[PDB]
Every structure is written in structure tokens, then in C-alpha cells.
Design a binder for this molecule. Structure first.
Ligand SMILES: *[C@@H]1O[C@H](CO)[C@@H](O[C@@H]2O[C@H](CO)[C@@H](O)[C@H](O)[C@H]2NC(C)=O)[C@H](O)[C@H]1NC(C)=O
Ligand SMILES: *[C@@H]1O[C@H](CO)[C@@H](O[C@@H]2O[C@H](CO)[C@@H](O)[C@H](O)[C@H]2NC(C)=O)[C@H](O)[C@H]1NC(C)=O
Ligand SMILES: *[C@@H]1O[C@H](CO)[C@@H](O[C@@H]2O[C@H](CO)[C@@H](O)[C@H](O)[C@H]2NC(C)=O)[C@H](O)[C@H]1NC(C)=O
Ligand SMILES: *[C@@H]1O[C@H](CO)[C@@H](O[C@@H]2O[C@H](CO)[C@@H](O)[C@H](O)[C@H]2NC(C)=O)[C@H](O)[C@H]1NC(C)=O
Ligand SMILES: *[C@@H]1O[C@H](CO)[C@@H](O[C@@H]2O[C@H](CO)[C@@H](O)[C@H](O)[C@H]2NC(C)=O)[C@H](O)[C@H]1NC(C)=O
Ligand SMILES: *[C@@H]1O[C@H](CO)[C@@H](O[C@@H]2O[C@H](CO)[C@@H](O)[C@H](O)[C@H]2NC(C)=O)[C@H](O)[C@H]1NC(C)=O
Ligand SMILES: *[C@@H]1O[C@H](CO)[C@@H](O)[C@H](O)[C@H]1NC(C)=O
Ligand SMILES: *[C@@H]1O[C@H](CO)[C@@H](O)[C@H](O)[C@H]1NC(C)=O
Ligand SMILES: *[C@@H]1O[C@H](CO)[C@@H](O)[C@H](O)[C@H]1NC(C)=O
Ligand SMILES: *[C@@H]1O[C@H](CO)[C@@H](O)[C@H](O)[C@H]1NC(C)=O
Ligand SMILES: *[C@@H]1O[C@H](CO)[C@@H](O)[C@H](O)[C@H]1NC(C)=O
Ligand SMILES: *[C@@H]1O[C@H](CO)[C@@H](O)[C@H](O)[C@H]1NC(C)=O
Lengths: 50, 107, 389, 171, 83, 50
């Protein structure tokens, strides 16, 4: 829904209030998105490198 | 009359989610410990300026407060929004209406 | 500038505001406030003036300082006054003695960190990589310093802790002339084999192309080194730091230590029980002093906070516009025409390079200071533990 | 870099947050200077005063003790040192926390303590002792027996006075 | 009975809960303590002295000076020439 | 073009400020080392014998 990025999608356990769309922690780094089709909170993890 | 708004008027600025973090936001808020007017609906429906947002704190137990009317000239020349509660479902419209010196309701 | 003197939001929410280097006739709640006190460092409003003089905790400057009784500002006093009655044919000789224990905390190293040379300023874009090739060999210049710093930290820790060629173990039967060392020796109950004081010290304190490397020396081996040093200095005295380990009863070791500082060895043998009781009482008192009273580990917390703040500022700088029309490279690439896209990405690249240079310089300065402090700590370890000062 | 300009500040605001460190570094160095001077000079918990009657076995410390006739109460060598050396667009200079009077008092306390009590005041409480029996200690500590001092007191006093006068003249 | 307020462009500091709900808000242009909290980015302030901001005096009016420059030329004379 | 002129002035002034700050930091570090040496010397030569 416009929020574009790269990473790996995993299942989550956090709880959103019924009106948020995407969460974050600090310095504009999204870490949780809910899919509009099913309304389930997910988790974003940066794709591995080193 | 005037009254002291102690700490009211804080709203969620965005739709993001955060957990246990101190965030500083610069936005439109009602200042803390401010002055607010106080009208009386006994023997008031005056015209009040908007001025880029407005608060509204209605504490009447009796179901008397019904709706609002917005506009820039309050005439059929320019569109005027209208919100009315039917006690079961709210109706909202935007098209013009002719101003009446005594706005009323009828069912 | 302006400043706010407060006694802490815990005790109260009353503050006094100080205007610096301003002869505040043109001062403009606190437009006038309480009595105005014009000092040598501006003027303070919100605190009254007194003619007394104590030792203070909130320095203001020019020899004056304020504290919360309201809030009062005065002139500091250097300390208590006492005059000794000097005479040319009289001396004073002590008749009793006490044994005291102190503490001293010294930092030796910080967190090893590294940053990707090109991932920080490009964000997985081929045009950024293509344009970076025209800026010379800044990559190696900005990448070698971090590896040098990490190697320096590793060598520093290794040389400050590793000073024994073997590992010594305390005897199972502990009868050290009445002294009680059970609060210093490792506890077999704990899986990590850490002393009680070490446990209290540990409990007292609490990606975008950047990473942190793990230290070579883990905690268990550091604890083993400390335990070996302590067992060696209890059993063998101080002869284990020169050659082999030679056993010696603790009482005669203390007799030698008293003989070293001038007091004859008879005093210890005639006053063993009192010395043991005083040492036990002091070692018990230091336990509560370290437990109940916090804020005794300011240096380590300051270092950690400084490093974290520097890293957070560096990572937050990535969101700046830097004079362009957008803060993200991909949108500019996919929305605008190339000929000005080179200009936009050049502006972004130069800004990010400036930020990286500043961060590297700050890290170098901090590493140098830490190295000096750890050298001092190593000298203290070599001198005041393996012998007598 | 702006000189109280609106559009200058608006253009500058888009360069991110960078002056925060540019001010915190200066605050840190100021705190470092204050801590440095306090740690160097403050090492005694009390203040000592020399007795009014001064007879230190022939030694003369007049040119080193504070002079009770100056507003600043400074010794002679401090006055010569002070007289020997002599030296607004958004920058300021902050005054030091410890004025000159506190430093002078600290130095006077250290001097009186080392003159009267020897070295016993740096390891606990101050213990009185005559000066000659302290010079005997100091000679005995360097391998020369104390018999030498008590038979050569006048020569040592004269040499010390001449040396201090010579260094005063040289300064 | 309906009070009416008026919003203004202010700055606030908000402390989010663990569940994501706002539980505490602090103004930023009310008291020096509020400014100190804003600068420190915390709701607890330890004992000490803090540097918050700086002030400067704004100019009141403007003045301008110029020489007398009284050298009027016959430009004003040709318009009143008889012939 | 006033924007370009202001940008040039700002970047030059920022470079000068950074240089000054770095020099001040180096001088402060050296002064701190000297002060530490002086404190050690005073402590070990005034309060006792060397
Ligand atoms: C979008 O449409 C899909 C398809 O119907 C919805 O998914 C179903 O929603 C109903 C709601 O009662 C569930 O009972 C079904 O189990 C869902 N099926 C699947 C395959 O997910 C979805 O809920 C709709 N989203 C909305 C309305 O927001
Ligand atoms: C040693 O004796 C001398 C002679 O009395 C003491 O000097 C005075 O002691 C009294 C006793 O309290 C004090 O009130 C005086 O102030 C002392 N005189 C001066 C000039 O200070 C001296 O204090 C004694 N020393 C000890 C350690 O008891
Ligand atoms: C030296 O001081 C210690 C204590 O600081 C004295 O020991 C005390 O003696 C009294 C009476 O004998 C006891 O009531 C205390 O419990 C002792 N204290 C401790 C800590 O053991 C000791 O007597 C003093 N020396 C002399 C010679 O009086
Ligand atoms: C050293 O001090 C510790 C601390 O008190 C002593 O440990 C106590 O030991 C007794 C019996 O051995 C227990 O009943 C206590 O509960 C222990 N104290 C604690 C705090 O747990 C230890 O015995 C002392 N060692 C010597 C040799 O006296
Ligand atoms: C200690 O030295 C000082 C040097 O200033 C002496 O003070 C003056 O010394 C000159 C030289 O003889 C005299 O002419 C002055 O009268 C002295 N001034 C005073 C105020 O006395 C001081 O006399 C010397 N003291 C001793 C005991 O030798
Ligand atoms: C936060 O959200 C949770 C989940 O909706 C609320 O419910 C609590 O959840 C915790 C964790 O399982 C339980 O221990 C509590 O007993 C739950 N409380 C209730 C009333 O159901 C919780 O109330 C919310 N608020 C807080 C402060 O946790
Ligand atoms: C504003 O509020 C204060 C206190 O809340 C009140 O005394 C005053 O009458 C109000 N109105 C004005 C105009 O100050
Ligand atoms: C509200 O009630 C009036 C009265 O019957 C009706 O005409 C109108 O359609 C109602 N509107 C809604 C939204 O229910
Ligand atoms: C906080 O306040 C309480 C009660 O006034 C006091 O006991 C405690 O020592 C204070 N702590 C600090 C860190 O100021
Ligand atoms: C402060 O200014 C006033 C006049 O504004 C003047 O009389 C006074 O002497 C000044 N004091 C100082 C210390 O500058
Ligand atoms: C402090 O002392 C000065 C001079 O002795 C005097 O003028 C002043 O009134 C005193 N103030 C107080 C509060 O004692
Ligand atoms: C000409 O003379 C008349 C009469 O005094 C006067 O009003 C007018 O200003 C003069 N014109 C010029 C150009 O001086």
C-alpha cells in the first residue's frame, strides 16, 4: 500500500490498536506491517549480509 | 465566561505504531493550561470562527446537542457542509442551503 | 545563552534561571520572578542570596554556586579551618591504627564496530556505485582505521589482563589466620564461577550497513585470569610475579608487609585478632556501600552512552535532504531525468561522505583516550598488585 | 553562519542535525578543563595556617609564604610570575569556576602543611614535628646518616637562603 | 454547555506505552523545566545545570543619515525664463 | 541563483568550523595529558619524598 522496501517477512505476535497501519521503532525503520486483505500483523527483517 | 483547559486536547498525530519511546512532535495542539469559553444553551447558537481547527467539549447528559454547520459565508452562493445525528445513524452532506436566522430540526 | 539550575525533578519542581554574560537591566512568569542577583557570570533569577558559605554540589562559576536548602546561591568554602600548634620541642606519635578498603574503577576497552564502505551511502543502487568510482580511493582510507582500532582494542585488553604464565587454584581448606576471604573467592554455585562482588557489579549496570564485532576474550576467561591472580597473591605472596610460586603462611606475609612500611613485625603478632576483625568489618561495609549506593560507575556508563549517542547520530543523519529535493535515492532515480539526477546524487554523496569523515575522526580521538587510560590501568595492575608500592 | 537571517536558517535546517555535536564537544572540553584544574589543585580536606611565631631552625621562608599586606594575599614569587607574562560575532568565553584566590589559598595550605607536619598530613591526620628533626629524616632517607645534619646546620641554612635569593634574582 | 478551544502550532513530547497508547504528554514552550525536559529527551531530570537555548535582542527601529547635498542647479530656472 | 550563493557560503563556513573544532579537540587532549602528568608529579613529590 505504497510502503515499499526490501527484506524477509515473518510472523509476529505484537498487538496493534484497531486503527494503525504500519509500526516502527526509531529513525524511520518499519518493523511491522498488516496486510489489508487479511489484517494480520507481520514482521520485517533486513535481508542478511556480511 | 472563561474556564481553564488544564491538560485536554491531545490526539494521535499519525497512524504509526510505537512502543515505549519518547517522541517529539511539532504539530497543531491546544496549548496546555489555556483559556476556553463556555456557552449556555438556556434562555446559545452564535457564529464562531474556525481559525484552522477547533475543539469541542459537550457534557450535556440530555440528548440535546445534535450537529454542526460549516461554511465561509453561510449562503447558497458557496457550499456548506452539514452533519446531523438521527440517534441511530449520522448523515453528512456538503451542498448549499439557504441561511435561516433560526436553525432548527424536524422529524 | 540561558541555563536552568534545578535540584532534580525527584525532590521538587522549582528551578532558577541564569542569563549568561548579560547585565540584565533588559531582562525581558520569570520576567522578574524572585530577587535578581547580578554575578560575575551574568545574572540569576529565582534564588535568593545568603552570606554563609558551605561546600556545594551545583557549580555556577566565578567562585559562586547554588544549592537547594527554596534554592540559595552563595560563595563556596574550601573546607574546614584548623591550625596546628607548631612548637620546636614537641612531637605527636600515634597510638592506634585502623585498616580501610577503597575502590577504583578503570575502563580498558569499548565496543568494536565497523561500517560498510559503500552500503551506507548507496543503499543498493547501481548508479550510486557507478558515480562513486570517480571520487578516488576514499573507501580504503575510511575502512582501514576501523580495523586498526579493533586490533588495538584486542591487543590492549590482552596485554592489560594476561600477566600470568599459569593458573593457580586455592586450596580446599581455607584457614587464613582468621581472615575471611569467602566474599572474594569464586562461588562454585554460580555456573559462570563469578564472585559475589562481580555479580553485584554486573547487575549494577543495565542494521543499515553497520555491525559490531565480538570480542576475542570472553567473560569466563577474564574471570579465570582474575581468580588466578587473586589466588596467587593470597598464597604465594608476591614472589609469583618474578619467578616460580613459593608458599608462605598469610600471617608472616602480613608481617613482611608491615615491616616494609616501617612498623615492626611485633605489632601484627601482638594485634592479630583486632586486625582480622577490622578487615572483616571493612569488607562487609564495602558490600553495602557498593550495593545500596548507585552512581559509583559513572565512567563506564559515560563511555557506553557516548558511543551509543555517536552511532545513533550517525544513523539518523541518513534522513537529511542535504539540499536536494528528496531524501531517498530510489525515488529520485525512478522519477527524475538523469542530467540533473547526477547533480542530486552528487550532493547526497558529498554530504554523506562528510558525515562519515566526522564520525571516523571522533572514533579515532575516543580510541586514543581509551588507550591511554588502559595503559595507566595496566601499569597500576603491574605495580600495586604483584608487589608493594 | 547566518547572522540572524530567516531564509538562511530555513536553508540551513535541511542539512540535518549537526550543530548538536558542535556544541556538545565544546561543553565536554570545558568540563574537562574544570575537572583537570580541580583534580590537580584540590588534594587536602582542610586548610592550615602557619603559626605567628616563625623560628624554623635558622631557615628563612619569608620570600615563599603569603604576604599579609596585599589585597590578593599572594607570595612574592607568585607576584613576579603574574607580572612576568601578560597577553563578538557569536562566540563567548566562559569564566573559570575556581578564581585566583582559591588557588592561592590551596597553595598556601599545601605549603604550610608540608612545612609544619612533614609528610604525615598526606596519609591521614596532620602530626606536628620540629623542622630540624624532619631534615634529619630527609637526609637519613637518602643514605647520609643524621649525624651530618646536626653538626652542619648553619652551613645548610646559609646555602638554602643564598640559593632562594639567587633563584629570586634569576626569576 | 459546550466549551470551544483553538489549536495552535506547538511542539509536544509524548511517551508511548508498551501497548502503543499515549500515556503522558509534556509541553515545550511553557516553563524552563519543560524546555529542559525537551532538550534532555526524558521526563526525569537529575540535579545539575543544563544548557537549553540562547536569546538575542531584536532591533527596535531604523535610522539613516545622508549629507546636506544642497547644490541645486539652474534646472529649476529654465522653466521660469522670461524669453 | 541566490540559493546557490548561500549554499556555497554555508559549505565554506561549515568547513572552517569543522577544522577549528578538530584543532581545539587535539589541543585539549594534549593539555589534559600534561595536566595529568603535573598532578602525578605534585602528588608524589610534595606530599612525600621521591
Ligand atoms: C477480502 O475478501 C476476502 C475474500 O472473501 C475475505 O476473506 C474472507 O473473509 C471472510 C470474512 O468473514 C472469512 O470468513 C473468510 O474465511 C475469508 N477467506 C479467506 C480466504 O481469507 C477478506 O476478509 C476480505 N477483506 C476485508 C473485507 O477486509
Ligand atoms: C599538645 O599540647 C598543646 C599545648 O596545650 C596543645 O595546644 C593547645 O591545645 C589546646 C587543647 O585543646 C587547644 O585548645 C589549643 O587551641 C592548642 N593551642 C593552639 C595554639 O592551637 C596541642 O593541641 C596538643 N596536641 C594534641 C594533639 O593534643
Ligand atoms: C584501637 O581501636 C580499636 C577500635 O577502633 C579498639 O578496639 C575496641 O576496644 C573496645 C574496648 O576494648 C571494644 O569495646 C571495641 O569493640 C573494640 N573495637 C573493635 C573494632 O574491635 C582498640 O582498643 C584500640 N586500641 C587501644 C590500645 O585502645
Ligand atoms: C565469612 O563471612 C561469611 C558471611 O557471613 C560467613 O558465611 C556464613 O556462614 C554461616 C555458617 O558457615 C552461615 O550460617 C551464614 O548464613 C553465612 N553468612 C551468609 C551471609 O550467608 C562465613 O562463615 C565467614 N567465614 C569465616 C571463616 O568466618
Ligand atoms: C628573610 O628574607 C627576607 C628577604 O626579603 C628578609 O626581609 C628583608 O630583608 C632585608 C635584607 O636584610 C632587610 O633589610 C629588610 O628589613 C627585611 N624586611 C623585613 C620586613 O624584615 C627577612 O628579614 C629575612 N628573615 C630572616 C629571619 O633571615
Ligand atoms: C495492554 O494490552 C494487553 C493485551 O490486550 C491488555 O491485557 C493484559 O494482557 C496481559 C498480558 O497477557 C495480562 O497479564 C493482563 O492481565 C491483561 N489485562 C487485561 C485487563 O486483560 C492490557 O490490559 C493492556 N494494558 C496494559 C497496561 O498492559
Ligand atoms: C485566562 O485564564 C485565567 C486563569 O485560567 C483567568 O484568570 C482569565 O480570566 C482568563 N482570561 C484572560 C483574558 O486572561
Ligand atoms: C433521519 O431521519 C429523517 C426523518 O425521518 C429522515 O428523513 C432521514 O432520511 C434520516 N436520515 C438517516 C441518515 O437516517
Ligand atoms: C529521590 O527522592 C527521595 C525522597 O525525597 C529520596 O529518598 C531519594 O534519595 C531521592 N533520590 C535521588 C536520586 O535524588
Ligand atoms: C548595567 O547597566 C546599567 C544601565 O543599564 C548601568 O547603570 C550599570 O552600571 C551596568 N552594570 C554593569 C555591571 O555593567
Ligand atoms: C550580607 O553582608 C553584607 C555586608 O556584610 C550586607 O550588606 C548584606 O545586607 C548581608 N545580607 C544578608 C542577607 O545577610
Ligand atoms: C517658477 O516660479 C513660480 C512662481 O514663484 C513657482 O511657483 C515655480 O515653482 C517656479 N518654477 C520652478 C521650476 O522653479
Amino acid at each position: 500500500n505504497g510502503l515499499t522496501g526490501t527484506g524477509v517477512l515473518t510472523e509476529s505476535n505484537k498487538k496493534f490498536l484497531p486503527f494503525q497501519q504500519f509500526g516502527r521503532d526509531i529513525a524511520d525503520t518499519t518493523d511491522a506491517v498488516r496486510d489489508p486483505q487479511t489484517l494480520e500483523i507481520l514482521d520485517i527483517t533486513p535481508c542478511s549480509f556480511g | 465566561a472563561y474556564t481553564n483547559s488544564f491538560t485536554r486536547g491531545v490526539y494521535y498525530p499519525d497512524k504509526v505504531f510505537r512502543s515505549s519511546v519518547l517522541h517529539s512532535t511539532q504539530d497543531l495542539f491546544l496549548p496546555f493550561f489555556s483559556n476556553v469559553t463556555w456557552f449556555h444553551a438556556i434562555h446559545d447558537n452564535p457564529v464562531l470562527p474556525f481559525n484552522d481547527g477547533v475543539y469541542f467539549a459537550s457534557t450535556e447528559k440530555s440528548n440535546i446537542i445534535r450537529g454542526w454547520i460549516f461554511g465561509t459565508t453561510l449562503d447558497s452562493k458557496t457550499q456548506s457542509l452539514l452533519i446531523v445525528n438521527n440517534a441511530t445513524n449520522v448523515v453528512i452532506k456538503v451542498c448549499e442551503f439557504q441561511f435561516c436566522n433560526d436553525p432548527f430540526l424536524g422529524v | 545563552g540561558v541555563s536552568v539550575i534545578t535540584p532534580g525533578t525527584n525532590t521538587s519542581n522549582q528551578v532558577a534561571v541564569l542569563y549568561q554574560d548579560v547585565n540584565c537591566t533588559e531582562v525581558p512568569v520569570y520576567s522578574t520572578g524572585s530577587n535578581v542577583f547580578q554575578t560575575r557570570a551574568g545574572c540569576l533569577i529565582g534564588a535568593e542570596h545568603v552570606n554563609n558559605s558551605y561546600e556545594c554540589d551545583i557549580p555556577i562559576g566565578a567562585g559562586i554556586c547554588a544549592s537547594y536548602q527554596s534554592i540559595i546561591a552563595y560563595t563556596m568554602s574550601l573546607g574546614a579551618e584548623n591550625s596546628v600548634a607548631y612548637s620546636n620541642n614537641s612531637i605527636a606519635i600515634p597510638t592506634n591504627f585502623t585498616i580501610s578498603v577503597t575502590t577504583e574503577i578503570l575502563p580498558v576497552s569499548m565496543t568494536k564496530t565497523s561500517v560498510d564502505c559503500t552500503m551506507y551511502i548507496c543503499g543498493d543502487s547501481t548508479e550510486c556505485s557507478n558515480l562513486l568510482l570517480q571520487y578516488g580511493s576514499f573507501c580504503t582510507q575510511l575502512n582501514r582505521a576501523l580495523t586498526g582500532i579493533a586490533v588495538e582494542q584486542d591487543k590492549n585488553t590482552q596485554e592489560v589482563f594476561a600477566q600470568v604464565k599459569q593458573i593457580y587454584k586455592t586450596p580446599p581448606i581455607k584457614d587464613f589466620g582468621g581472615f575471611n576471604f569467602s566474599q572474594i573467592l569464586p562461588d562454585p554455585s554460580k555456573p559462570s564461577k563469578r564472585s559475589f562482588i562481580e555479580d553485584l557489579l554486573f547487575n549494577k549496570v543495565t542494521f543499515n550497513g553497520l555491525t559490531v564485532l565480538p570480542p576475542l576474550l570472553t567473560d569466563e576467561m577474564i574471570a579465570q585470569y582474575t581468580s588466578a591472580l587473586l589466588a596467587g597473591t593470597i598464597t604465594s605472596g608476591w614472589t609469583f610475579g618474578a619467578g616460580a610460586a613459593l608458599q608462605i603462611p598469610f600471617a608472616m606475609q602480613m608481617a613482611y608487609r608491615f615491616n616494609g612500611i616501617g612498623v615492626t613485625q611485633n605489632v601484627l603478632y601482638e594485634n592479630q585478632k583486632l586486625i582480622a576483625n577490622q578487615f572483616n568489618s571493612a569488607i562487609g561495609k564495602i558490600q553495602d556501600s557498593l550495593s545500596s549506593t548507585a552512581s559509583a560507575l559513572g565512567k563506564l556508563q559515560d563511555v557506553v552512552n557516548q558511543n551509543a549517542q555517536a552511532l545513533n547520530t550517525l544513523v539518523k543523519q541518513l534522513s537529511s535532504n542535504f539540499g536536494a529535493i528528496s531524501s531517498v535515492l530510489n525515488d529520485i532515480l525512478s522519477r527524475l531525468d538523469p542530467p540533473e539526477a547526477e547533480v542530486q546524487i552528487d550532493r547526497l554523496i558529498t554530504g554523506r561522505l562528510q558525515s562519515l569523515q566526522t564520525y571516523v575522526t571522533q572514533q579515532l580521538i575516543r580510541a586514543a583516550e581509551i588507550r591511554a587510560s588502559a595503559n595507566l590501568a595496566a601499569t597500576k595492575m603491574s605495580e600495586c598488585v604483584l608487589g608493594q608500592s | 553562519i547566518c547572522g540572524d537571517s530567516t531564509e538562511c536558517s530555513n536553508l540551513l535546517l535541511q542539512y540535518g542535525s549537526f550543530c548538536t555535536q558542535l556544541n556538545r564537544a565544546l561543553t565536554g572540553i570545558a568540563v574537562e578543563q574544570d575537572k583537570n584544574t580541580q583534580e590537580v589543585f584540590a588534594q587536602v580536606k582542610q586548610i592550615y595556617k602557619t603559626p605567628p611565631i616563625k623560628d624554623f631552625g635558622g631557615f628563612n621562608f619569608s620570600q615563599i609564604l603569603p604576604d599579609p599586606s596585599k589585597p590578593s594575599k599572594r607570595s612574592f614569587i607568585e607576584d613576579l610570575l603574574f607580572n612576568k607574562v601578560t597577553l563578538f560575532n557569536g562566540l563567548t568565553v566562559l569564566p573559570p569556576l575556581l578564581t585566583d584566590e582559591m588557588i592561592a589559598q590551596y597553595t598556601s595550605a599545601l605549603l604550610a602543611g608540608t612545612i609544619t607536619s612533614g609528610w604525615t598530613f598526606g596519609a591521614g591526620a596532620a602530626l606536628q614535628i620540629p623542622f630540624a628533626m624532619q631534615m634529619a629524616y630527609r637526609f637519613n632517607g637518602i643514605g647520609v646518616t643524621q649525624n651530618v645534619l646536626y653538626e652542619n646546620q648553619k652551613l645548610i641554612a646559609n646555602q638554602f637562603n643564598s640559593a632562594i635569593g639567587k633563584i629570586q634574582d634569576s626569576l | 454547555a459546550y466549551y470551544v478551544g483553538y489549536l495552535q502550532p506547538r511542539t509536544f513530547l509524548l511517551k508511548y506505552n508498551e501497548n502503543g497508547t499515549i500515556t503522558d504528554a509534556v509541553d515545550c514552550a511553557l516553563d524552563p523545566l519543560s524546555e529542559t525536559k525537551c532538550t534532555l529527551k526524558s521526563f526525569t531530570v537529575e540535579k545539575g545545570i543544563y544548557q537549553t537555548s540562547n536569546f538575542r535582542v531584536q532591533p527596535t527601529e531604523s535610522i539613516v543619515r545622508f549629507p546636506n547635498i544642497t547644490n541645486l542647479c539652474p534646472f529649476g530656472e529654465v522653466f521660469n525664463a522670461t524669453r
